[PDB]
Homo-oligomer: 267 residues x 4
């Protein structure tokens, strides 16, 4: 008697057990969903992480920059879930921006090749995934992507913030296409979560950037009327599952904020 | 086994069986919630409507313009749900603007007495209800109000649109207060519901379409916010409008 | 040649020489505008303040809560500027919220009578002024009101923030009406300025706690603003209002221009 | 006694006399500004402007053009002189990403070229020119409101969403020099590509789509909207280049007849 009982859902973006996608996958399985997972590059290592999930799930290779991976995705998912079965949900939890465009490097010093790679992986791929998977989605279906509120500029995030602005626009266009299939498309704008890259910047991977991210995180918990725990991805995973469910059936091309309400408060 | 199993929820705003609050109340009961209902003025007529709901629920009088009704509300709800029990949810589905400020009357011809009454009932009362009920709410609780996107001006809705702009601001302040109790506060901005060119353009803009004769998708959205499935969302607006507000043409 | 050469502009909201309206009036006169000023209640005291402006201007009584003052306004302005002459600009620089709705008093403790008075003066009156003055405005005309960004909640401002949310909505409806006359309607959302009430809260009038939270708000504003923010200087705000009163933003209406050092565009 | 008397302003984006940049350049010269123009033929068009102005080559995708830009501008305005204004009126999206081609059928090479020219180049131009800008300076870019999706504009709308974000970051950098950075979000203007789509170049369906958008725009705008007249847009850019909006940065000013503030 789970929120997602009998739903077939594809979850991309698991790299470590701290990944937001790991928590999305875990909560979805606790709620009765049958998953199909996608991983990038380090598949053997990712399989060791996904073995820690409460239930078994097939793991498929997917590099969103690889046109052949995208062209074969629907076929490979259909083989994993059985012929005549379609997906009810798709989770895009993919993002990347090279250090030249996200970190200590000045905003003006990011070369376009790095910015373009970042936008391809972080924004364009939301449309690529929808193009590949909409033909194998059921009506009442739901596509969810991960966002970080880019309405205002902030230190260090730089070109990743620009990529999120592009993602929000892409989501609105994806909703127009998804609507033809009776499928919704939405983003979850999360507050800061201590994943691999976030733990590295706070850890000093130098001093100036580390301090900026610390100040940003402290301010977030301060502004949030219900507080914000950057070490806990569960409220974010629950929000994604709410959008994957049948309980937000008239919401599409939109953004749901799972940020403790921090974006609604100035001070 | 439902979405709101064992939750105690107060639902205001039922006047007819077409009221958005009637559909919110119906879906919440289908999902296992134990309700307390509030009504305005025509209580005998409202009790006949609430008798049509799938389960029994106590009906309490509440005129949001009446300070005595507000002062006694928590006490009356506690008596209805039993001593030692608190609310998990509150639904504000109240709105009114006299014809002088909402309809065919020119925007400039609405007298302030009418605008003030409309704002009192439609916006200020969201704070009044939260003030009265937060002392009797459990942590993890949820306050939901009804909204109509007022970010852009439109024909006829005139001063009611102004009242919705005020409501959205009130909601952000209510969230600051509610947070102290571990309670969330959010609005559901719905598309038009039958409770003409403006309403036709909605279904055309909406990527998943819009059915103005069906309040169920709106009621389901309210129930999602009343549940434990949006635990990090507060002082916010969820749009149950078929996605029309995200599309220009 | 001034930015507003030969323009006839009504400016409301002067109470002290620190009032944003005083600085709007001063810059407009420096730029060649012919003004008509409106004041509330203490008119003799306001006349002593307006005598400090670079040029003479008739001062008319206007209580926005007084229906008779609104009904006679157009007639009184016409008498001041001469028959056959119309206004090119209108500046609404009026705001009020009692201490029960704006200050140290809890958000839930503001009674509706106080909130209603505050909304009447701060939001509804923008429509009242437009209704009274649009029949005596020239095409190409401009109505400007003062705003404080209410998109997010903040400490102390409380019901004044709610009144500003209502004002922004009113402005969008006023633009629909003004458009029929070839007149624009816009708001200038300013950063914090040390006017009468602002000087009082910073000074400790509302206590230690309120003084500290307004100080923190002001420091954060100058920090966030990429070009900084000087709360002691109303001139950048006055210049922005004059830009909207000019012919240089001719396709902007029902809108908000931010004169806040760019603070609202930055998170940290 | 013009709005921009004695100001030295760089204007990019002139291709035809219908280009928004042509009208920005014309109004700025009428208002006393001394211009430096950049083009990507164009000299024959710029000869139609009221005053003479040096024309410099600038392909924003060309790293050598960007690296030498400040030096070439300094040579044109004289040593010891700096710019007071910069106008970015550059945009491009191949037909695969903007037009009749389905949103999902745009290849990344085309989208990436479009984003490079339309969004990233706003940061490139600021990087190259901020070292040669005076305090009180102003950088202005052209935008088309991308807050909501719309037919045909597709990936160009995505590029504009990216541009709005870029502008907010450019403002942080510009602030260090006492320089403002803002965008003007204009309503539809009948420039080269816009005249082609309305004319039927992309077919019957696309032509009808853009005609409906234009009609709706004029209808919603409380003061109306004339798509054949770029002058209100050029005036707005000049207002931002002036000293009259000195506390506005990382922002968007809408020169759209107020259409974006009205639903119907
Ligand atoms: N961590 C936060 O603070 C935070 C906040 C808000 C939103 N988000 C977003 O949440 C999403 C997940 O990030 P995370 O924080 O869980 O971090 P993460 O590092 O654990 O996850 C990012 C994932 O993207 C994958 N990826 C990168 N390049 C790829 C490619 N070419 N093909 C396919 N997948 C590729 C990586 O393998 C990884 O699994 C991202 O979109 C991120 O922007 C994160
Ligand atoms: N109908 C739509 O198209 C639409 C769209 C979006 C949002 N909404 C909002 O949803 C809410 C419910 O409206 P509805 O469409 O269900 O219509 P409705 O007429 O059925 O409900 C409005 C309710 O407000 C109550 N009310 C009025 N004055 C009151 C007072 N003094 N004290 C207490 N309650 C009072 C009425 O008794 C009634 O039950 C309102 O806030 C409305 O603005 C409606
Ligand atoms: N000071 C700031 O930090 C700040 C920031 C942003 C916007 N604003 C806005 O700027 C405007 C001017 O405020 P200010 O800061 O110059 O303060 P102020 O105290 O100098 O001016 C407010 C004016 O409102 C007038 N007023 C009040 N009740 C009135 C009534 N019934 N009829 C007519 N006039 C009436 C007062 O007489 C006074 O002249 C207001 O709308 C305010 O909300 C101020
Ligand atoms: N309806 C509209 O026309 C409209 C609406 C809003 C905003 N805008 C924006 O206004 C700006 C000007 O466009 P326009 O409508 O005048 O069209 P246009 O065709 O007249 O101008 C576009 C310019 O971009 C230049 N450009 C393209 N690739 C370049 C490169 N690699 N390096 C340098 N320059 C390059 C072209 O040479 C041309 O000068 C654009 O940013 C556009 O997106 C246009
Ligand atoms: C003798 N007269 C007064 O004591 C008086 C005048 N105008 C007032 N409210 C106006 C001021 C101008 N304005 C502003 C001012 C600042 C931001 C936005 N709007 C509109 C509201 C006013 N309000 C009550 C009050 C009484 C005493 C105060 F110290 C404040 O300051 C304050 C509170 C909260 C946030 C910022 C500042 C406010 C009192
Ligand atoms: C010989 N050169 C070309 O054929 C050419 C020039 N610039 C172009 N794109 C520019 C146009 C101006 N601009 C705009 C225009 C309108 C809104 C936003 N940006 C930036 C992008 C361009 N794009 C492909 C295209 C090719 C043919 C067209 F009719 C269009 O028009 C169109 C498409 C979709 C929406 C509105 C209009 C576009 C082609």
């Amino acid at each position: 008697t789970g929120l997602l009982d009998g739903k077939r859902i594809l979850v991309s973006g698991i790299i470590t057990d701290s990944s937001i996608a790991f928590h999305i996958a875990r909560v979805a399985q606790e709620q009765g969903a049958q998953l199909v997972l996608t991983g990038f590059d380090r598949l053997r290592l990712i399989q060791r992480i996904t073995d820690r999930l409460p239930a078994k799930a097939p793991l498929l290779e997917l590099d969103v920059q690889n046109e052949e991976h995208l062209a074969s995705l629907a076929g490979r998912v259909t083989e994993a879930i059985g012929a005549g079965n379609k997906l009810d949900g798709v989770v895009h939890s993919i993002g990347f921006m090279p250090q030249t465009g996200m970190g200590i490097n000045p905003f003006f010093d990011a070369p376009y090749a790095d910015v373009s790679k970042g936008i391809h992986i972080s924004a364009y791929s939301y449309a690529s995934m929808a193009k590949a998977l909409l033909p194998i989605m059921n009506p009442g279906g739901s596509i969810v992507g991960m966002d970080f509120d880019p309405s205002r500029a902030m230190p260090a995030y730089n070109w990743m913030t620009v990529a999120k602005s592009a993602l929000e626009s892409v989501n609105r266009f994806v909703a127009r296409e998804a609507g033809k299939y009776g499928v919704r498309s939405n983003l979850v704008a999360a507050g800061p979560i201590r994943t691999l890259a976030m733990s590295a910047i706070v850890g000093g991977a130098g001093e100036e950037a580390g301090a900026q991210i610390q100040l940003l995180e402290e301010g977030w918990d301060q502004r949030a009327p219900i507080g914000w725990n950057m070490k806990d991805a569960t409220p974010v995973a629950k929000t994604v599952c709410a959008l994957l469910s049948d309980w937000l059936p008239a919401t599409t091309g939109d953004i749901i904020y799972a940020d403790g309400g921090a974006h609604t408060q100035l001070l």
